[PDB]
Amino acid sequence: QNPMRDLKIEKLVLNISVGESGDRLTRASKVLEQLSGQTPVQSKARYTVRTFGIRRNEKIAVHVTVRGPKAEEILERGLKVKEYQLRDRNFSATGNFGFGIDEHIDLGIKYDPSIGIFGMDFYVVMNRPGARVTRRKRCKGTVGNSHKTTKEDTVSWFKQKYDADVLDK
Amino acid sequence: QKDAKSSAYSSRFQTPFRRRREGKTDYYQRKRLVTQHKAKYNTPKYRLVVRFTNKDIICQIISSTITGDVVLAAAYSHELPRYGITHGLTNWAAAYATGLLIARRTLQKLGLDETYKGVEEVEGEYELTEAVEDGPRPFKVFLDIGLQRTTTGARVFGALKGASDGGLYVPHSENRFPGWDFETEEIDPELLRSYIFGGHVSQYMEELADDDEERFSELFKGYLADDIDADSLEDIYTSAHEAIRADPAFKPTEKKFTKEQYAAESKKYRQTKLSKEERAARVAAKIAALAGQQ
Amino acid sequence: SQRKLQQDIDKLLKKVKEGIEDFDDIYEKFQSTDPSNSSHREKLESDLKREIKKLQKHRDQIKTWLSKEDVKDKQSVLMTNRRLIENGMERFKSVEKLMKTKQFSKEALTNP
Amino acid sequence: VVEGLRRARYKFPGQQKIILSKKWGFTNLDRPEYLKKREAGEVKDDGAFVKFLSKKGSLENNIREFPEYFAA
Amino acid sequence: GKSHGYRSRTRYMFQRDFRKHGAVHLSTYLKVYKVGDIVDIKANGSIQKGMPHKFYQGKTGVVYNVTKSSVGVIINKMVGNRYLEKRLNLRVEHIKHSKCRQEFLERVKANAAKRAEAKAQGVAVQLKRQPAQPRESRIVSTEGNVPQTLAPVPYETFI
RNA sequence: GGUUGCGGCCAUAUCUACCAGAAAGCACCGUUUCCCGUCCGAUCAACUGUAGUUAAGCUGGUAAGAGCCUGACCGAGUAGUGUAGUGGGUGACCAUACGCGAAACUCAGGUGCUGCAAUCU
RNA sequence: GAACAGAAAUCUCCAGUAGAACAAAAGGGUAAAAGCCCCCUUGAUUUUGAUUUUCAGUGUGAAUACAAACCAUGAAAGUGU
RNA sequence: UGAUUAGAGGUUCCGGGGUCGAAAUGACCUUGACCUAUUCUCAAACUUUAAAUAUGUAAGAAGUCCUUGUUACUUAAUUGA
RNA sequence: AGCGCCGUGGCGCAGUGGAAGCGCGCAGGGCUCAUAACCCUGAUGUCCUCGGAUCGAAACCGAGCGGCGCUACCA
Ligand SMILES: [Mg+2]
Ligand SMILES: [Mg+2]
Ligand SMILES: [Mg+2]
Ligand SMILES: [Mg+2]
Ligand SMILES: [Mg+2]
Ligand SMILES: [Mg+2]
Ligand SMILES: [Mg+2]
Ligand SMILES: [Mg+2]
């Protein structure tokens, strides 16, 4: 039936994969911390690759995970930039989705010439209550099939919320 | 079409132990716990098994045999109403009281209670049950916290402290008790005593009742219904401790029924297996309907 | 015989040392050519090229010696001689690139 | 084909025998057993071989294939 | 050159088995060994400490020493023209109790019970085992068992 | 008989797809002052048992289910093999005598049992 | 599945009995680990003995299990020569 | 695990060809791979399974049972060894 | 047959884990009446093939292909 199987936002992860380390990475991290209210975490390259100009253990990206009401606040702040319009490609087969934006000033962030301009990748992980069966330490289990979120119910949720429309296929 | 497993995979799959599949036992820890110095031939090794569920604390004294584990004595948090604790049956003080109760219970049923009185005047100091001379050694038991995280302030160590102050000899250091300052490697006894007597919930009750009354009515509703204010829980915990030291004798319930009386209704409710002949009849009817051209 | 081997070891080591020595004087005279004398500059380049080719050949022999020949005692001096040959090699490479670069070629014009 | 195999036998060392098998082709069933199996619908041809219906397995797939055997 | 290490030719011997890899069950640690017990040696590849040499795999010996996590066993090794006694310190994961010894102890107490019983009657217990004696006479009937005649079969290809 | 804690043997217990689950118990669940830990009170920690829900977990059942397990005078006394011959055969190898004796295959059946303690219409 | 970002950069979910990794040859062994990350450390310590392999039951090398100390870690059982 | 024969059914938002094509997360057909269910033949350094022959031990008096003596070992304990 | 070397631009050759160059040729422009010479520039590679180690190499370690050189003695 439908007692407490409502699709809530588990988390929103904001990723910024910079081409290199240094001042630009620190500036992107300052963008992320003034946006999210939390300090972000940097991510090193898994291996060397010459055509992208990165070495192993280089700190080439920075991301942050946001939960709670601030998650949907930043999400609607990005959705109004995306015109409340998303491709169905943007929705995963497991029920999660995401979208990338450029030029983060669209989110109402007052520009400072110190930090500069950065594009981001939003990804939204959705689930139902009872998701800690797979996350807890003791008596770890797997979520049932009728409780698994998927693309059809998450696009129905996303359309009945936000008054949004999905794009063609 | 996607979530499929091959017959070779299912034939080569080695299932773990059943408790591992259930996710309830760490066998790596169990081997180090239950094994004995072989020159102590049949000497049992005793585990203080402390488990925390929602709404309950389970304390057991358990030895191990080859056919299974054997319980000396158990103490649950839901029988603290015998001793005057009605609310907060999973907090730190309830863990301490359960540890003290199972310690006194095992000491009484072993006869080691008139000696090894434990700590009567509780003040929050760190000390173990020392062996009294000219007499028997104290009963030795080791913790089995299971998969629970060792953490400074965790109430498994409140159960530890309760069992140790009850007169049991359980080996431990003090760097996991609340009040252990990290940079100054010492224990603060007064914060530990406050945690024993529930100061950490009484302070919350006060700093909620002063400003946010809707939360203080949502939770702590039972304290409001039973006129329990913040300062009283210290003395009801002291009275529960002295009642525990008065009689840990484990009066059980009257059960309201019999084993077969429960079993009749549950046997009526449980689903049964489908026998071979009726399974064959089922598949024959499935052939006659599905494959019988509708 | 290990004796005949170590004999030719010592022979190549003294040949390498005198080759380094008549490389270094050509190097410093290249740096002191008074670069107006461009003919003498190019002569000094082509003169130290022969010496570094001789040392390169000796280095290949040292490579084979350390690989297969069971030198059995003198890994140290064979390695130090190899390090000196290769440092003279990159010295010659810096010299020869410095003369080979052209003043308005694209490699000169992008980054001084 | 007996003469072809007899001609091919000269190219081999040792002794070889030419045996007419009682099996239907490259299968493992005898001729009348395969005949009484194929008059019903429990055979289903493949590229060159043939798949058989077994009493084991899911009834749904067993009826999805071999429908003529189940159309009794 | 030749190779005779401590674990030469132990490839399949110290393999674990099919589908019982991983940790060992707790009965091996819960079992109690005493001085004079008779134990069989079967090495466990999962436990690398205290392993027996490959010669002693499947060998049966007598316990002479009990330590914290190990057991001293005495084996008779055939060396040259005589046996030598070999003292082995083996962790208990490579050791199990011999079942023949306890089945002999049950036979001992059963013989004791028989003797103690029949001492009150004097009926000549005859406590020794006896081999399989030749079977004595019997009369087999044909009622519902008329003999069925068999014959050798001719040759057929069967391909 | 159900359930919880601790287990023993470690798939007859696992896996895939559905269905059901009185009571209680577990569970999801609610909160962030305190101890504590995280980029994130998601995990971990603490508090409440209050606001709710059996949706999931968990238990059970179903499936000519996969897998697994047991048995067969099913294959087959076959393959192989110890011993014997001044046995056969140019040889390769193969029969016979006294003995031991499989695996796959096929068919049939089954799909956790159980220990200590506590609790439940 | 997610801007630049593509076959390969970073992030998220699902499946995943090991198809990876464990300095090196190959072979065993290992999944709340023996793998990866983090914290603390020096037990890679002292005193001599016993035992296993090679074997003459000699040596050398390597290894095993205890005893007597002094320590490390961990809540602890324990583990560490 | 590795080797290996032959077809069948499929999958390309995703191999190479042509065709209808301006192209299209378009269409038809050809050929390669990837998957599914089959099929033929194999392994000293592959294996679920697994013999025969060889191989270790035991079949008591130095044994068993009952009772209670020693210890500085061991146990919470006259508990065990 | 064994051993050792070599294989890089069109030709002859260098080349050490952060990774392809020297000379002559070739192309464009200039000078010259014109061509050489000369001046200013530019382009040029399956690093013999195949696989592996490495985070990564032409280099390190293997399989062959091709071409060279040394030895093949005592009767
Ligand atoms: Mg642990
Ligand atoms: Mg084996
Ligand atoms: Mg070691
Ligand atoms: Mg660990
Ligand atoms: Mg030795
Ligand atoms: Mg030690
Ligand atoms: Mg020109
Ligand atoms: Mg000209």
- The residues with which D45 forms a beta bridge, in sequence order, are D50
CB within 7 A of strand H (chain E, 73-102): 76, 78, 98, 100-101
Question: Amino acid letter at D68?
Answer: E
Give the closest of D59, D67, D71 to B286, CB-based.
D59
Q: Which of A68, A66, A59 is closest to A36 using CA atoms?
A: A66
Residue of D nearest to E159 (CA): D21
The answer to whether residue D31 neighbours chain E at the CB level (below 8 Å) is no
* Residues of chain B contacting D66 with CB distance shorter than 8 Å: none
Residue E158 region, left (φ>0) first, then alpha (ψ -120 to 50), else beta? left
Q: List, as own/partner pairs, every contact residues B271-280 make where C-beta atoms lie below 8 angstroms and the sequence separation is at least 24, other chains included.
A: none
Q: CA-to-CA distance for A153 and A155, rounded, in angstroms?
A: 6
CB contact under 8 A, D71 and B287: no
Q: Residue E78 corresponds to which tokens in the numbers above?
A: 């055939």
If one counts every other C-beta atom within 10 angstroms of the C-beta of residue B1, the result is 3
Query: Which has the closest alpha carbon to B199: B164, B227, B237?
Result: B237
Tell me if A12 sits within 8 A of A120, measured CB to CB: no
Q: Which of residues 130-159 of E touch strand H (CB under 7 A)?
A: none
- Positive or negative CA dihedral for A154, A155, A161, A162? positive
**E124 reaches B (C-beta below 8 A):** no
CA of E11 to the centre of ligand 2 (A): 9
- Please give the Cα distance from A130 to A75 (Å, whole number): 23
Chain D residues in contact with B286 by the CB 8 A cut-off are 59
Q: Which residue has the tokens 């199996």?
A: D37
Nearest to residue B105, comparing CAs of B123, B124, B118? B118
CA–CA dist E37, E35 (Å, integer):
6
Terminal Cα-to-Cα distance of chain B (whole angstroms): 28
**B281–D contact, CB cutoff 8 A:** no
Nucleotide F19: nearest residue by CA–C1'?
A: B271
Euclidean distance between CA atoms E125 and E116, whole angstroms: 10
- Four-residue CA torsion sign, B223, B224, B226, B230: positive
Q: Which chains touch C (3 or more CB pairs under 8 A)?
A: none
For residue B69, give the nearest of B25, B121, B105 by alpha carbon.
Answer: B25
CA of E51 to C1' of G53 (A): 12
Burial class (CB in 10 A: 0-12, 13-18, 19+), B233: buried
Calpha distance C107→C99 (Å, rounded): 13
Q: What is D3-51 written as a DSSP string? A: HHHHHHHTTSSS-------SBSTTSSSBHHHHHHHHTTT-EEE-SSSEE
CA B26 to chain centre: 16
One-character DSSP codes across B164-191: HHTT-B----STTSTTEETTTTEE-HHH
Nucleotide nearest to D15 (CA to C1'): F92
As a rounded value in angstroms, the CA-to-C1' distance for E42 and F77 is 34
Nucleotide nearest to C53 (CA to C1'): I14
Is C86's CB less than 7 Å from nucleic acid strand I? yes
Distance from CA of E41 to the nearest CA of B (A): 18
Quote the tokens at residue D63: 């009826």
User: Is the Cα dihedral A61, A66, A70, A75 positive or negative?
Assistant: positive
Cα separations (Å) of A118 from A26, A76, A93, A121?
A: 12, 19, 29, 10
Nearest CA in chain B to A93: B2
Rounded to 5°, the CA angle A50-A51-A52 comes to 90
HEC string for B60-120: EEEEECCCCEEEEEEEEHHHHHHCCCCCCCCCHHHHHHHHHHHHHHHHHHHCCCCCCCCCC
| Closest C-alpha to B141, from B242, B72, B52, B42 | B72
Q: Which residues contact B226 (CB under 8 A, 6 or more apart)?
A: B86, B87
Task: Calculate how far, in angstroms, residue B53's C-alpha sits from the geometric centre of ligand 7.
Answer: 91
Amino acid (1-letter code) at residue E157: T
Nearest CA in chain E to D22: E159
Euclidean distance between CA atoms E44 and A159, whole angstroms? 60
Query: For chain E, what percentages of helix, strand and coil (3-state, to nearest 5) are there?
Result: 20, 20, 60
CA Rg, chain D, in Å?
Answer: 18
The Cα of D67 is separated from the nearest Cα of chain E by a number of Å equal to: 31
Tell me, yes or no, if E157 comes closer than 8 A to chain D by beta carbon.
yes
* Radius of gyration of chain A measured on its C-alpha atoms: 18
The set of residues, in sequence order, having a beta carbon less than 8 Å from that of A147 and lying 6+ positions away, is A5, A128, A130
Which chain E positions have a beta carbon within 8 Å of B27's beta carbon?
Answer: 23, 26
Q: How far is the CA of E49 from the centre of ligand 3 (A)?
A: 7
- How far apart (Å, rounded) are the C-alpha atoms in residues C79 and A34? 57
In chain D, which residues have their Cβ closer than 8 Å to the Cβ of B288?
Answer: none
Report the SS3 class of residue B6: coil
Nucleotide nearest C67 (Cα, C1'): I60
Residue with tokens 């008139």: B114
Rg for chain C, CA atoms, rounded:
18
What does the alpha-carbon distance between residue E110 and residue E115 come to, in Å, rounded to a whole number? 9
Please give the full DSSP string across B243-270, using - where no structure is assigned: HHHH---------SS-HHHHHHHHHHHS
Determine the distance between B266 (CA) and F39 (C1') in angstroms: 50
Please report which helix (H) or strand (E) contains residue A120, including its range: strand A120-127
Secondary structure element (H or E) that encloses residue A122, with its range:
strand A120-127
DSSP designation for A49? B
The closest alpha carbon to E57, from E70, E71, E75, belongs to E75
Give the residue whose CA sits closest to G50 at C1'. E87
Residue A116 CB partners (closer than 8 Å, separation 6+): A24, A27
Task: Identify any residues that bridge with B52 across adjacent strands, giving them in sequence order.
Answer: B57
CA E96 to chain CA centroid, Å, is 10
Between CA B181 and C1' G12 the distance (Å) reads 39
The technique is cryo-EM
Q: What are phi and psi of B49, to 5 degrees?
A: -85, 115
> Which amino acid type is present at position B143?
L
The number of beta carbons lying within 10 Å of the beta carbon of residue C54 is 16
Kindly tell me the sign of the dihedral angle through the C-alpha atoms of E30, E36, E40, E42: positive
Q: Other C-beta atoms within 10 Å of B184: how many? A: 8
Reduce the DSSP state of residue C15 to 3 states and report it: helix
Q: Answer whether D23 sits within 8 Å of E157, measured CB to CB.
A: no
SS3 C25: helix
C106 beta carbon < 7 A from strand I? yes
A5 and A126 Cβ atoms separated by less than 8 Å: no
